[PDB]
Amino acid sequence: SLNIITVTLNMEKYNFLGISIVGQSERGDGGIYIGSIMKGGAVAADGRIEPGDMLLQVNEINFENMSNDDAVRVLREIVHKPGPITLTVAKS
């Protein structure tokens, strides 16, 4: 059953998300997943996003039908800039 949440991290007290991502989307097949979360990042601090959650959107960028390589580069660009980061995930 679909369980999709949108989480805003203010990135004030944290210098990175602290996630690894695996997989990519065949239309409707696979997806980009949170592989691991490290303590001391913004994602661990919030605690709602877990390994096995599917990454759907970050800020104004959709991650459905994005390659894993492209997803890593987009995330680096966003985390290396100041401001809040809004992640939309599908819970496992």
Interface positions with ligand V31 (CB under 6 A) = 16-21, 36, 38, 41, 72, 75-76, 79-80
Any idea what DSSP says for residue 9? E
Q: Which is nearer to ligand V31, 1 or 6 (CB)?
A: 6
Q: Which is nearer to ligand V31, 27 or 80 (CB)?
A: 80
Q: Which is nearer to ligand V31, 2 or 68 (CB)?
A: 68
Cα separation of 80 and 4, whole Å?
26
CB of residue 65 to ligand V31, shortest distance in Å:
17
Question: Do the beta carbons of residue 77 and residue 61 sit within 8 Å?
Answer: no
Any idea what DSSP says for residue 53? P
Question: Do the beta carbons of residue 42 and residue 34 sit within 8 Å?
Answer: no
CB of residue 4 to ligand V31, shortest distance in Å:
20
